[PDB]
Every structure is written in structure tokens, then in C-alpha cells.
Amino acid sequence: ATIGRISTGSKSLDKLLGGGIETQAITEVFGEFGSGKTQLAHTLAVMVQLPPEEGGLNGSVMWIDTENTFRPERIREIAQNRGLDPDEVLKHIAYARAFNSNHQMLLVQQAEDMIKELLNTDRPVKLLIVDSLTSHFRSEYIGRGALAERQQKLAKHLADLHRLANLYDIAVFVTNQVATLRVYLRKGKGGKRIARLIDAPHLPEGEAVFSITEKGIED
Numbered sequence: 001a002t003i004g005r006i007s008t009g010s011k012s013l014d015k016l017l018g019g020g021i022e023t024q025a026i027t028e029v030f031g032e033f034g035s036g037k038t039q040l041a042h043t044l045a046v047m048v049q050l051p052p053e054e055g056g057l058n059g060s061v062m063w064i065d066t067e068n069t070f071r072p073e074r075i076r077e078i079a080q081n082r083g084l085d086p087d088e089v090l091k092h093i094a095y096a097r098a099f100n101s102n103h104q105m106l107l108v109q110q111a112e113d114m115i116k117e118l119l120n121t122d123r124p125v126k127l128l129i130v131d132s133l134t135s136h137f138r139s140e141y142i143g144r145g146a147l148a149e150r151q152q153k154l155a156k157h158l159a160d161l162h163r164l165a166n167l168y169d170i171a172v173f174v175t176n177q178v179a180t181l182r183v184y185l186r187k188g189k190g191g192k193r194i195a196r197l198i199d200a201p202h203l204p205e206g207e208a209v210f211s212i213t214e215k216g217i218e219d
């Protein structure tokens with residue numbers, strides 16, 4: 001289908017990204033604790049539920065959590081501050097906690113069941129979040145003798161995510177620490193945050209400054 005764009009809530013960040021995050025693509029956001037990557041994930045889980053006129057895609061969300069960072073109270077707060085019903089917004093976020101890298105991989109495969117069920121409805125899955133992509137892979141595969149299998153397993157996981165994104169017109173959004181759009185977050189001045197786009201093949205490298213508010217991400 002046509003490439004849909006989900007607003008991040010920030011006009012500055014959306015301009016940097018070419019209008020927002022894309023369906024049929026993996027957007028990978030990097031940053032240290034406090035850089036705003038989890039705030040962006042929570043904001044996008046709300047924004048995607050809005051109609052296109054308001055920066056969303058009238059969509060449902062699937063969220064894979066590798067380390068206990070999903071906060072339903074933060075969704076409710078962002079939803080209510082954006083004029084949405086907080087309970088309805090939460091009902092349209094399917095949640096899974098992944099306990100290890102094998103289970104994380106299995107969940108991406110299992111997500112296809114619900115994606116297929118909602119595909120021709122009024123609320124198709126339009127956003128699949130994996131927070132935080134490599135935490136289990138880094139913990140489970142230590143050192144020299146483990147790199148080949150860690151890379152093999154991560155490549156398969158990413159291929160599985162790209163397949164769902166392309167086949168079902170979903171924006172895949174992943175968070176991490178240091179063929180996919182890579183955005184680097186950092187602390188800016190006066191409690192603001194900065195996003196830097198690096199090595200995008202068809203978007204200029206640039207920076208966007210944004211704030212974290214009761215609405216989640218905004219300028």
C-alpha cells in the first residue's frame with residue numbers, strides 16, 4: 001500500500017523524518033537512559049490511533065517489551081492530554097513481555113496472528129514497537145565465540161520485523177543503545193532533547209530539538 005506516516009507529536013522531529021515515522025519501514029531510535037526514546041515510543045502508541053488529519057493512521061498497536069519499560073499510566077496521561085479516551089487508547093495496545101531473546105523472536109512470529117485478524121477492520125495494526133531490541137541478545141551472547149550466533153539471530157529477528165512491516169503496511173519502531181532509519185537521541189539544553197538523523201539514504205542528516213510534556217513528545 002501507500003506509505004503512511006505517524007506524527008511523533010513534534011513538528012521539528014517530523015520535519016527531520018520527512019513527515020513522521022513510516023509504515024513499511026523500521027525506525028530505530030538510540031539513546032542513553034533519559035534521552036526520550038521510551039517517551040517517543042509511548043507518544044507514537046497514542047498518535048497512531050488518531051485519524052490522518054491529526055497525524056495518525058486510525059491504527060492499533062502491538063508492543064513487545066524486553067525490560068519492563070511500558071507504562072500504561074503514561075499512555076493514559078498522553079491520551080487524556082491529547083483529548084482521547086485513555087481507556088480506549090489502552091485497549092488498542094496489545095502488550096507482550098519478552099523474557100529472553102528466543103521468546104522475543106517468537107513474539108514477532110506470534111504477532112502475525114493479530115495483525116491478520118485486524119487487517120481489514122477499522123483498526124488495523126499500524127505500529128509494532130520492540131523496546132529494547134538488543135537487551136537480551138547482548139546479555140545472552142557474551143564475547144568472541146558468541147558474536148556469530150548473536151548477529152545471525154538478530155539478523156533473522158530484523159528480517160522477521162521487515163517482513164511484517166512490508167507485508168502488512170506497519171511502522172516498526174525499535175529502541176536500542178550503542179536498511180532502517182537510525183535516529184540518535186541525546187540530552188539538549190534546559191531539559192530539552194535533540195534527535196540527530198544519521199546515514200539516512202534519502203533524508204539529509206540534521207537535528208531536531210523537542211520537549212517531553214504531559215502530551216508526550218512535542219516541540
Ligand SMILES: Nc1cc2ccccc2cc1C(=O)O
Binds near residue numbers: 062095096
Ligand atoms: N498473543 C499476543 C501476541 C503478541 C505479540 C506481540 C505483541 C503483543 C502481543 C499480544 C498478544 C496478546 O495475547 O495479547
